[PDB]
Each structure stands twice: as structure tokens, then as C-alpha cells.
């Protein structure tokens, strides 16, 4: 129930997921907390993406091995093991950016998103058209 415009680029190397909204890099902390930071020297912003199926990815911390995941109430968290809450539909947006929709809650359009203050957005609060959901994958 979603378009299938996919972004270029591959998953060969790790990446930083830069959010245009506030200019924060998606960060996965050791305690499982998820947020954003502007500090490019941070050791928890290096992410390795992998495709489980065409257009479906896992997003993992290279530093801690944790998987980005969105829970039943729309909150992002770091998971120690891969589960259905760790799969995201990676799509092109505005002919330029990358967006990540929770596969588990795809029917409700719950996106991975960062606010201007660097805090994560809760699933139900995200939607097409926001800058919070637009990411650019940059080399590490």
C-alpha cells in the first residue's frame, strides 16, 4: 500500500543518516535510547543498513550491534535482536531524500523522524510532508 520509488546507492558501506529538519545525525545509544546529535565525531551515529527484501531494510549501529526499531506505541528504541519492529520500508522522497516507514505499522504511515531539537518523533506524529522524516545517507 505504498509507492515503490527507491533511492540510489547501496548498502556496501556504513552511513550516517543526516536529518534535514534540524541537521541531526540519527543516533543509537548503548542503553537503547534513540535520538539525534549534531556532533559528527559521535561514535554511535555510524549505521549499517542491509536489505532483507528489495526496499526493506534493517538499520544497525556498527558500534553496539543494536537494531533501530519502533514499538507498538510509535517510540523508536534500540533492539538487541532483529524482530518485526526492526524492518523499515526505505523509499525515495521529493525525488531526493530517503524516508523510512515502519513496516509493522506501514498502514498508518509511521515514519522514523527527528524533531528540530534532536528528539525522535513518535510514530503517529509523523506524516508525509514533514522535514522531520527526510534523511540523507552520508559516508562515514
Residue 12's CB is within 10 A of a number of other CB atoms, namely 8
Burial class from Cβ neighbours inside 10 Å (0-12, 13-18, 19+) for residue 34 reads buried
Check the annotation: does 109 bind a ligand. no
Annotated binding site for heparin: 21
Pick out the residues of the known binding site. 21
Amino acid at each position: 500500500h505504498h509507492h515503490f520509488n527507491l533511492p540510489p546507492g547501496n548498502y556496501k558501506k556504513p552511513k550516517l543518516l543526516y536529518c534535514s529538519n534540524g541537521g541531526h545525525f540519527l543516533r543509537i545509544l548503548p542503553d537503547g535510547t534513540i535520538d539525534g546529535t549534531r556532533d559528527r565525531s559521535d561514535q554511535h551515529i555510524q549505521l549499517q543498513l542491509s536489505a532483507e527484501s528489495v526496499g526493506e531494510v534493517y538499520i544497525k549501529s556498527t558500534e553496539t550491534g543494536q537494531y533501530l526499531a519502533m514499538d507498538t506505541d510509535g517510540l523508536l528504541y534500540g533492539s538487541q535482536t532483529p524482530n518485526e519492529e526492526c524492518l523499515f520500508l526505505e523509499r525515495l522522497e521529493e525525488n531526493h531524500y530517503n524516508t523510512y516507514i515502519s513496516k509493522k505499522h506501514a498502514e498508518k504511515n509511521w515514519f522514523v523522524g527527528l524533531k528540530k531539537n534532536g528528539s525522535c518523533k513518535r510514530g503517529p506524529r509523523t506524516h508525509y510532508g514533514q522535514k522531520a522524516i527526510l534523511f540523507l545517507p552520508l559516508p562515514v
